Structure formats: structure tokens, C-alpha cells
Design a protein around this ligand. Sequence first.
Ligand SMILES: CCCCCC[C@@H](Sc1nc2ccc(NS(=O)(=O)c3ccc(Cl)cc3Cl)cc2s1)C(=O)O
Length: 260
Amino acid sequence: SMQLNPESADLRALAKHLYDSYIKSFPLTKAKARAILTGKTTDKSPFVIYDMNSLMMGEDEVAIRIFQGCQFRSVEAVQEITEYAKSIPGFVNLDLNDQVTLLKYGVHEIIYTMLASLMNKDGVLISEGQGFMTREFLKSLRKPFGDFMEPKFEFAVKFNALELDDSDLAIFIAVIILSGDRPGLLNVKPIEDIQDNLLQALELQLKLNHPESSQLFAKLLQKMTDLRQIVTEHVQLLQVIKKTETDMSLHPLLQEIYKD
Ligand SMILES: CCCCCC[C@@H](Sc1nc2ccc(NS(=O)(=O)c3ccc(Cl)cc3Cl)cc2s1)C(=O)O
């Protein structure tokens, strides 16, 4: 506890490595996002989709185009995340069918975690900061498509109140990926051993980075509960549309994950 020794040094090194890897794997960092969202960036201003009109001009059926755009991005997000996971010390030294498992059950949690970086009260940044689509507009979407992102915005405004930065999220995201309780893991003890290490790293990171804010570590770990709820409810809502809308197509790589 609050001791600058070899053990802590090693933990900071692990924080730094994770951070550096996160920057390399994740193009739109939270820091860039918040700049754009606060008008701080003197870089180019994004187009604001707030209605059907502004959706069209910006594009230069609706609900189904936007849904398919969310699934294409969902899939680049899985490539992004896969790369990161591989950078986590100990990850590639695991059974390739614990790697596939941790990523199968992990990706969606990470996706909604990081999506929060792109969100404020008003909406979400899209296409790497070139666009911004309003919360209320996503709601105005035809049923059932207007209920998908709503609960993410509810998650995001609470989560963003914690004021985590990329440093923090880097380690947090690792903690999630290495979750010791995903179905069908062969070698559970190694995964837990790495996560113990990450969890020490995160605790120390949070103490250093957040002097004013205590039980942040606690308050953060509880977010993993909210995340799993969100993913569950997301699947249930995807089950419905795959019934209601039995005419459109759902990318086959997501279907690989979703069915379990
Ligand atoms: C017209 C293009 C729309 C933007 C496409 C996605 C953006 S960012 C983004 N990325 C994801 C990733 C996942 C989700 N899942 S979700 O919130 O449950 C969701 C909300 C609404 C609809 Cl219609 C479908 C879905 Cl699945 C949403 C998003 S929004 C991008 O940069 O390309």
C-alpha cells in the first residue's frame, strides 16, 4: 500500500505497456473524442445528424441502414480489440480455445465500454469523429430499432461520471477480457493469475490518477455487472429483430458469437 518498490514499478510498466498498445490498436482515443465533443479540437467539426433531413445530407430504409452500419463497425471493433488482447502479457501463452472464448464473451462488453468514450448527454461521435448522431434521433427510429442504443446512453452517462481516461480504460478493458468465469474455459487458473495482476495494476493506477475519488476501484468493478446486463438485453433485442425482421441479413461473424 503506497510503497514505491520493485512490485509497484513492475505494475506501472504493465500500465504503460497496456496504454501504448491501446493507443496503437484504438484509433479514436477517449481524449480525442472529448476534445471533439467539447469543441476544444480546432480540427474539423463533425456533421450533426439530428433528424431525417440531416441524416440524408450527412449520408453523403433508415433504421436498417443505421443498424447495418452499427454491425460493420461492431466487426472492425472486434478486429481492433483482438489485436489489443494479443498485446496483454500472458494472453498468447494461453490455449487458443481459451483465447477464442475470452474474446467471444468479452468483445461486446469492451465495445459498449469504449462506445461510452464517444457519447455525451446529446449523442455519439461516428466515423472516427466526422459525424455525430443525436440520442433523441436514435430513439425516433422505428420500433424496435430505437431501443438498441438507448440503454447504452443510460450506461454511458453513469460510466462517464467516473471520468476515467485512456490510461485507466486500457487496464480496465484488459481486466474484462481476462474474465475467469466465461463458459467452456479449460485453463481457468492462469487467466485468474493474469487478472489478479491486472487488478493490482488498475487499483494502483486509480489511486495515483484519482486522488479526489475513493471507492472508484469498487465503483468501477461494479460496472462489469452493468455491462453483462447490457450485453444480455442487447442479445434479447437482437433475437426479437431476427424474428420481426426476417428479410434483412446479420453479419455471419457476430452470429458465430451471439448464438452462445
Ligand atoms: C449511418 C452510420 C451509423 C454509424 C455506425 C456506427 C458508428 S459508431 C457505433 N458503433 C456501434 C457498435 C455497436 C452498437 N450497438 S447498439 O448501440 O446496440 C445499436 C444501436 C442502434 C442500432 Cl440501429 C443498432 C445497434 Cl446494434 C452501436 C454502435 S454506434 C461508426 O463510426 O460506424
